[PDB]
């Protein structure tokens, strides 16, 4: 379920799901570094019926994972609403900006 682009909390992922890349929804694959910054999505949880803030931190410093590419756009907005925008590399400020995969971290309601 979590490895599917349709999984509820992946609603604003543009990238490869880290859970298909040797990591999980909340951990970077070995040898890849979390981004301190991210875009944010608001996603609806069909199970409990509530909406949640999801932080899409990237994992960085390794070349493209290539697995489970997703391009979902719920509530995503262009770069003049920068932290809602997912057509930029959220690895952009890491020590190494090479993009590896995207995580989907639950923040709160």
């Amino acid at each position: 379920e979590v490895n599917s682009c349709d999984y509820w909390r992946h609603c604003a992922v543009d990238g490869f799901l880290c859970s298909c890349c040797g990591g999980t929804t909340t951990t970077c694959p070995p040898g890849s570094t979390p981004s301190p910054i991210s875009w944010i999505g608001t996603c609806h949880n069909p199970h409990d019926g509530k909406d949640y803030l999801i932080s899409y931190h990237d994992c960085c410093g390794k070349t493209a994972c290539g697995r489970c590419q997703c391009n979902t756009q719920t509530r995503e907005r262009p770069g003049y609403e920068f932290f809602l925008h997912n057509d930029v590399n959220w690895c952009m400020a890491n020590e190494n900006s090479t993009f590896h995969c995207t995580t989907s971290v639950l923040v709160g309601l």
């Binding site: 770069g79 920068f82 930029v88 952009m92 090479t98």
Partner: protein, 360 residues
């Protein structure tokens, strides 16, 4: 006996050339520009652009500019963000121009890497993630200005009626205009009134750009305009792309570089799809709509061939569309576009195609 030689120029005339920016997202450190002849689909050559390159051709047609990021050991070591100048005919590297390590890394929207109308300055988007606009002096081969006044704004729309002016879209729903001096430093600036509601009717950043005005389409199929015939930009809108029947089937725009303007006629081209709802703003085109911007009414609609991005050549009356891998070539000399050919396998993952300039 035959002898292999190098040093050769591109085999087709400049006027035949198009540039397909292949992100190669699956292997993004080996992005490149593929150069094609649009008249016959022939592959002419390529320019390597390392990690997530961006590309534009100089306004005078003589050089190709790329923007990219290197690291000493790719995935580790010191970062170098650069602009490179390449010869357009030999497809060879000429000069590297150092940038601060904050050039935009992101999908290839036209407005992230542009130039002034006079061709003397390259104008590029930075994100650290704080946004600013960077200015490169082409003659000097130098980064000369960092426009921090553009914080909280995004993308560069050059004004074709002024030599060194451009606009950017800001978080307040208005436009910031920057006028550069002959040294590439900001000479003056101005801010428009609110053009669109950011919360209620966000626009796509891609302009349908005329000589003295620009049109933008929104997530819900409205059109906004910015008139820059004067020093102060005048803004208006919305008018709707949609009639009642269109609304009933929930038609809305979608794509990336999703609009274009044919300047002689005023026709605006827009990728559209039915069953629009939250989250469909990047969907492939079901149709291309052709809008008369004077009457503010649709004049034609044609199959979209799943296209995501387009570009227009004014002088040959052409539109290219691009579905990520394939480039379609259309004759737009009449209101209904006519499909001339498709170039299959032009890229693995491209969201941007551009003609070689012929205007000078």
């Amino acid at each position: 006996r035959e002898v292999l030689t190098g040093g050769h120029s591109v085999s087709a005339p400049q006027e035949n050339r198009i540039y397909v920016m292949d992100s190669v997202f699956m292997h993004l450190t080996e992005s490149r520009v593929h150069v094609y002849d649009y008249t016959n689909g022939k592959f002419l050559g390529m320019v390597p652009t390392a990690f997530n390159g961006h590309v534009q051709v100089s306004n005078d047609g003589k050089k190709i500019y790329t923007m990219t990021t290197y690291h000493e050991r790719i995935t580790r070591g010191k970062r170098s963000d650069v602009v490179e100048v390449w010869d357009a005919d030999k497809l060879t590297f000429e000069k590297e121009i150092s940038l601060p390590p904050k050039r935009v890394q992101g999908l290839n929207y036209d407005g992230l890497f542009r130039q002034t109308t006079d061709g003397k300055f390259i104008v590029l988007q930075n994100a650290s993630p704080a946004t600013s606009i960077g200015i490169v002096d082409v003659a000097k081969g130098d980064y000369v200005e960092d426009v921090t006044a553009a914080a909280g704004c995004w993308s560069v729309i050059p004004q074709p009626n002024r030599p060194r002016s451009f606009m950017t879209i800001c978080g307040d729903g208005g436009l910031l205009t920057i006028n550069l001096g002959e040294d590439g430093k900001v000479a003056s600036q101005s801010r428009s009134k609110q053009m669109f509601s950011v919360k209620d009717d966000p626009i796509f950043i891609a302009p349908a750009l005329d000589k003295d005005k620009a049109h933008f389409v929104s997530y819900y199929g409205n059109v906004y305009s910015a008139d820059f015939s004067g020093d102060e930009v005048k803004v208006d809108g919305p008018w709707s792309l949609l009639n009642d029947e269109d609304k009933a089937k929930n038609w809305v725009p979608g794509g990336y570089n999703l609009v274009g303007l044919h300047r002689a006629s005023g026709r605006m081209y827009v990728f559209m799809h039915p069953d629009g709802k939250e989250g469909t703003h990047k969907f492939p085109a079901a149709e291309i709509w052709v809008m008369d911007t004077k009457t503010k009414q649709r004049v034609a609609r044609i199959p979209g061939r799943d296209a995501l991005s387009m570009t227009i050549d004014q002088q040959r009356n052409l539109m290219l569309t691009l579905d990520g891998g394939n480039v379609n070539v259309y004759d737009i000399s009449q209101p209904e576009p006519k499909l001339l050919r498709t170039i299959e396998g032009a890229a693995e993952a491209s969201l941007q195609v551009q003609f070689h300039p012929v205007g000078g």
